[PDB]
Structure formats: structure tokens, C-alpha cells
Ligand binder design. Sequence first.
Ligand SMILES: CC1=C(/C=C/C(C)=C/C=C/C(C)=C/C=C/C=C(C)/C=C/C=C(C)/C=C/C2=C[C@H](C)[C@H](O)CC2(C)C)C(C)(C)C[C@@H](O)C1
Ligand SMILES: CC1=C(/C=C/C(C)=C/C=C/C(C)=C/C=C/C=C(C)/C=C/C=C(C)/C=C/C2=C[C@H](C)[C@H](O)CC2(C)C)C(C)(C)C[C@@H](O)C1
Ligand SMILES: CC1=C(/C=C/C(C)=C/C=C/C(C)=C/C=C/C=C(C)/C=C/C=C(C)/C=C/C2=C[C@H](C)[C@H](O)CC2(C)C)C(C)(C)C[C@@H](O)C1
Lengths: 35, 329, 331
Amino acid sequence: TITPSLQGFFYSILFGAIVLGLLGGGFIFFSQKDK
Amino acid sequence: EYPWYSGNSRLEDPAVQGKWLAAHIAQIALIVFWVGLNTFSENQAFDTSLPMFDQGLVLIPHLAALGFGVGSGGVVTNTFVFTQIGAIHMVSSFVLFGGAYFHAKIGPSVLATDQFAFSWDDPKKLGYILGHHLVLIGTGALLFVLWIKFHGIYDPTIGEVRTVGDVVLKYGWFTPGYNCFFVDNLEDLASGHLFIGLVDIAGGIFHINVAPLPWSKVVNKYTYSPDGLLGTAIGGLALMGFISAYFCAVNTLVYPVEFFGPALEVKFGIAPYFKDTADLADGFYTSRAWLANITYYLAFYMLQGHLYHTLKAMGFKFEDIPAVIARDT
Amino acid sequence: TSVLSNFENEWWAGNVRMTDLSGMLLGAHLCHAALMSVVPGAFIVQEVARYQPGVSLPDQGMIFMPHLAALGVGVGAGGEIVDTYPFFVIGVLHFFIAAVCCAAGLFHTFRGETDLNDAPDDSYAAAFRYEWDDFESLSTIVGHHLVFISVACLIFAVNATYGTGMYDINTDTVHQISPNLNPITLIGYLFGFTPDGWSGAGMAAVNNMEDVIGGHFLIGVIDLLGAAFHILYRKPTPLFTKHPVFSPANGGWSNVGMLNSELILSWSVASVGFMGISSSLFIRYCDVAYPPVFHGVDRTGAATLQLILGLVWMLGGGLWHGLRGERLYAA
Ligand SMILES: CC1=C(/C=C/C(C)=C/C=C/C(C)=C/C=C/C=C(C)/C=C/C=C(C)/C=C/C2=C[C@H](C)[C@H](O)CC2(C)C)C(C)(C)C[C@@H](O)C1
Ligand SMILES: CC1=C(/C=C/C(C)=C/C=C/C(C)=C/C=C/C=C(C)/C=C/C=C(C)/C=C/C2=C[C@H](C)[C@H](O)CC2(C)C)C(C)(C)C[C@@H](O)C1
Ligand SMILES: CC1=C(/C=C/C(C)=C/C=C/C(C)=C/C=C/C=C(C)/C=C/C=C(C)/C=C/C2=C[C@H](C)[C@H](O)CC2(C)C)C(C)(C)C[C@@H](O)C1
């Protein structure tokens, strides 16, 4: 059964995915822009 | 060519016909959309304890008359039915918007299936269209009759909802046991509605089946035209609005005093209006007063618009009016 | 093979090689169904092997027995498992189904013709020719599969109503419950309009078996009608054709209504993910369909598992295949 700590870890995976996605998206998008 | 403020006159062109159709669909959606939206706000502002004819509830009393949350009278026990009806109407609105947009920019610019395609001067086309719409209208009337048979609507004399003889040929003569604007019998309402549904369906069958006849093509001097057809429709609408306003003002069986408030007194200053005959607080009017007066004056201006469109349909041009007043300075 | 992304012929992507090979694709689906049906029967037999009578199901960690006990299989009054043999029968019958599916998959992968476009010209098998472009062909497939799903749902409802019924949570035992057929009441749940007021979890706030059984009757009838619709017509309509779609195929909305193999796969995958999320809500809240006499009370873990799967299918798979299909609409 899910406990509060495990749910916190799941939210951590969400936030970490978001951070990495925004960083990588910014980098790749800007690299593609001024090709 | 037309200016932007008169932009809808552009739809008069048979060059762009289907888009014209789209507009009408949109209108109905808007209409049914409001039926949802209004109710929701009403359901928000409707206190159960207070009499239902004090706050701005117009649709809620109409539902209350059709059963829908009334018991021994003056009884409100579930506001969920009103929300259900409003949601049904508002959801139908989305479908009608979809159809409107399909014809507006996705469908053909001009209908010229072609069976739906018509022209402003094709009396057989309009005859069959008229028949079909009449059939649907009579079907709705018979549906109301079935609702009376099975569910049954609120009655004040019985004090409760109840379910259910054609002396209609005497009501039409307004014999002193009549003047339908004073009906007080559920059986009378049901029988008359059965009769009107039957007659509407018969007329629809007839109009689909038979083309317009020369004898009645004599009198219709100019209505075979866009402006003429619109004018006749508007005049019919105004007539209906006057009748509905009078019914709402006078009749109490259909419009119970519980949800609508007491009857109205017809008063006349420069123009007619309807007074409450109720000791409501100053600045407040029963829902019956609002319904009767707004309906009546909308019908009056519908009559004026009917005159305008009819005059334009015949040989008359209003832009000549200042020029005349120019010559006779 | 009907794709040229960069890596079409890579062994780790080799399933794409069956994009057009109808016979092999049919065999592959049949073998996969064999897997999907082996698991339940095998794990039910394994569960019944270690089942103990005194302890209750939630404390034994069984993940297939609760769903069977919810249907009155081997349970009596008070919601206690009495006899374990019918679970074993269910497991064995799933073994049979899996064996038949695997036999079919083996036939169509090796013995059967690889591409049904090479069938011998109306040999009982050209009737099964389909193409990922023509709509008419795939319409009858959707119709017949809807027939099967509808018959299953109707069978479930009919069993519940007439024969041996289900374990009704409120009545505390297995009963043939009298269905509720108020269509407005049932379809209200879809917007949360439960009788006790609007509820956050749609379709999941049912508090009586009658609602669910009536809903199943409604769904069965609807799916049967849709099956008739698709089998009997097979023709594109202005709903599919001429609908707005936003895609870089043409930057901005277009009314093309494109069709493609990856697109069909993507819509199916998104549908599955959505069902996963809906089931997540269901097992989280709806305890009429999941009596805590069997599944336990705390059920956050299973709901979270469903949530993760639904997100993976709806977002990941759906997006990936939709984007690939839209890009392939540059042919
Ligand atoms: C002849 C003519 C024309 C005019 C033509 C027109 C406009 C003629 C007018 C026609 C009208 C106004 C006809 C109206 C008919 C009304 C009917 C048929 C009413 C039916 C109502 C019923 C059946 C009510 C039924 C119940 C319903 C209700 C519930 C009651 O509780 C009970 C009960 C039974 C009374 C033109 C325009 C062609 C040319 C002119 O110059 C001359
Ligand atoms: C559209 C168009 C135009 C024409 C536009 C026109 C002429 C539009 C006409 C608009 C009108 C006159 C609309 C009339 C609306 C009527 C209303 C709003 C009725 C109101 C009644 C109320 C509010 C109730 C009043 C009570 C309230 C209370 C119960 C009292 O106890 C008694 C009683 C019943 C009087 C132009 C001229 C602008 C340009 C053209 O080319 C196109
Ligand atoms: C076609 C289109 C698109 C797609 C649009 C989408 C996403 C459309 C979505 C379509 C959906 C989600 C259709 C699904 C409808 C679901 C239905 C009809 C469910 C019915 C279920 C019922 C009636 C069951 C009810 C019960 C039955 C059940 C057994 C339980 O006892 C609970 C109880 C009693 C509520 C785009 C995105 C491509 C472009 C759009 O503009 C248009």
C-alpha cells in the first residue's frame, strides 16, 4: 500500500522529469533554432 | 453588397446558401445553450424556503409546473432535476454548434444532398419543408400529451400532480363556459393538446403530400420571396407572443399561483402593461409579471419588425424617406 | 517496410517488419493473447494451491482470487470462501483458451500464408483481406470485435440478473439483483451526477449493484448497435472525414482526417491508457465493484499501479505512435 513517503518519492520523480525535460528541451530547441 | 452592421443580409444570397443554414443551427444552439446557462444561475440563487415567485426564477417555475420536484404543493425536494434538464440542453448545444460549424466552413458553400437544396421561389420545396416542420411540431405536442397521460403535471385544485373529451369546437366559439384563456381543467388542456398535435401532423402530411394551390397562390401576392417569407414568419411569431403573454397574465391552472404568483391586472397608460395585484415588496415583481410584460413587448416589436420586412418585401424602400422630406422641405 | 524513420530494419524494432504482413500479424496477436490468458489461469491455480480457509483473502496477498470471489465463485453468505474448486476450473479453462490461441498463432506464423493479399482469390481467406489504407476493410473488423465485446458484457449482466447473480455488497451475500434501468440516472454518473450529488470520481460512486448491472445492460446494447452500424455500413462519414486535427503535417488545424497504421495503433493505445486511468479511479473509490471483504480496504497501491500504466499507454505510447503516424502522412 502507498505510504506518504512513497508518494513523495513519486512526486520527486515527476518534478525531476519536469526539470530535466525543461533543461533538455531548452538546450535542444535553442540548438535547433540557430542551426 | 451590404455593410458590416447589416452583415447578415449577405446570407440572403443564394450564392452562399449552406452557410445561411449554419446560422440558423447556431441560433438554436444559442437558444438551448441559454436554457442551460440560465437554469444553473437560477439554481444557484433559488432559496427553497421563500415563495418561488419572489426571486428571478422564470424557468424553475416552468419546470415546477411540469411536476419536477413538487409534492403536495409548495414543495421543493430536489434541485437536481433542474440541473439535469439544464445540462441536457447545454450538452445538446455542443452538438448543434458542431453541426453549425460543419455547414459554416466545412460543408458546401451552396447546397446547389440537393434534395435539401431549395430556391426562394420553389413552392413545392417550401411546401414539403413546411409539412416536415409541422409534423415535428405536432409530434412534440403529442409528446406533451403522453407526458400528461403518464407523468401528469401539477394541479392547484387537486393540490398535487396528476395524470389524465373534445368540446374544443365550443372553446373556439368562446361560449361563456369557455374563453380558453381561463381554462381550469387538466382534461381540457390534455384534450386540446391532443387535438392540436393531431391537426399539426395532418397538416404536415398534407403539405408534404400536396403542392400549394392556385386559389391560395392568388392571395400570397408577394410572400414567395426572402423578405416576404421572413415577414410572414415574424408576424406569426408576434401573434403567438401576444397570446402567450395574455395566457401568462390571466391563466392560473397552467401557471400556478404557487410558483408564479397571483393573476395580473391589465392596465393601460400610454401603452398596455400588467400589474401585480400582489403585496410584494417595493421594487420586486412576481415572475408572472416579468414573463407577461417582456413577452408582450417582445411580441409588439416583432409586429413592428414584421411590418418593416413586409413593406420591404413589397414595392417599398425606406431609404427614400428622407429624400421625400427633402423635396417638401 | 512502409516506414523510413531512420532504423526500420533493426532487430530490436523487428516487429515493425510485420506492418503489412497480415497473416504473420494475426499470428503474433494470437500468440500474445495466449500469453495474456496463460497468466490468469496459472496464477489462479498457484493461488488456490496456497489458499488457507481461516484467514481472509486480503491477508493472503491474492491478486486474482478477489476478482473471482466478487462474482460469487466459491463463496457463500457472509463473504467467506467456502469451496476452492471453481477457481481451479476457471484457471483450467484459461489454460484451454491459451492453448487454442497459441495453436492459432503457430499456424498463422508458419503454416498460414504470410500475406493475405496472396490468398487464392476467394478461398474463405480473401474475405479477411485488410489494408491499412482502405476504411471499408477495417470497419467490419471493428464491428465484429464490438459484437464480441457486447455479447460478453450482456452475458455478464444476464448472469447477474437471472442466473446465480453476483455477491452484492449491501445484501451481504450472492443474489440475483433486480437491475435499475433509468437511463438518465445511469448516464448522469459519467458527469459525476450521482443521486447523492455531484461526485469527483465519475462512474465510481455507484453505491448499489443495480446501478452497475443496469449500466452493463446499457453498454451491451449500445455496443451491439455500434457493431451493427460498423458492419453494415463500412463507409466513411463526415465525422471521421472532415474533422479538425492539429499536426505539423500541415502546420495548424486541418480537416483532412488522415488514416494510417501508426495512427490506428496510437488511437487504440490511447484508449487503453484511458481505460487504465478510469480503472485506477474505480479501484480507488468504487467498493461496490470491489468489496473490501475481498480486496481489502486500503487500495492505494493498486490504483497507483493502474495510474502508472494508464499514463505510460495514454501519454507515452499514444503520443509516440501518433507523432510517427502524422509524420508518415507526408506520403
Ligand atoms: C385571408 C388574408 C390573409 C390573411 C391570412 C391570415 C393571417 C389568417 C389568419 C389566420 C389565423 C390567425 C389563424 C389562427 C388559427 C388559430 C387556431 C387554429 C388555434 C388553435 C388553438 C387550439 C386548437 C387550442 C386548443 C387548446 C389548447 C389549450 C391547452 C386550451 O387550454 C385548450 C384548447 C382546446 C382551447 C392574407 C395574408 C393571405 C392576405 C390578406 O389580405 C387576406
Ligand atoms: C438590428 C438593426 C437595427 C434595428 C434595431 C432596432 C430598432 C431594435 C429594436 C429594439 C427594441 C425596441 C427592442 C425591444 C425590447 C423590449 C424589451 C426589452 C421589453 C422590456 C419590457 C420590460 C423590461 C418589462 C417592463 C415591465 C416590468 C414590470 C413587470 C412592470 O410592472 C410592467 C412591465 C411589463 C412594463 C438598426 C437600426 C440598429 C440597424 C439595422 O440595419 C439593423
Ligand atoms: C473525433 C475527435 C477527436 C477525438 C475526440 C475524443 C477524445 C473523443 C472522445 C470520445 C470518447 C471518450 C468516447 C467515449 C464515450 C464513453 C461512453 C459513451 C461511455 C458510456 C458508458 C456508460 C453509459 C456506462 C455507464 C455505467 C456502466 C458501468 C458498467 C458502471 O456500472 C457505471 C455506469 C452505470 C455509469 C479529435 C481529438 C481527433 C478531434 C476532435 O475535435 C474530434
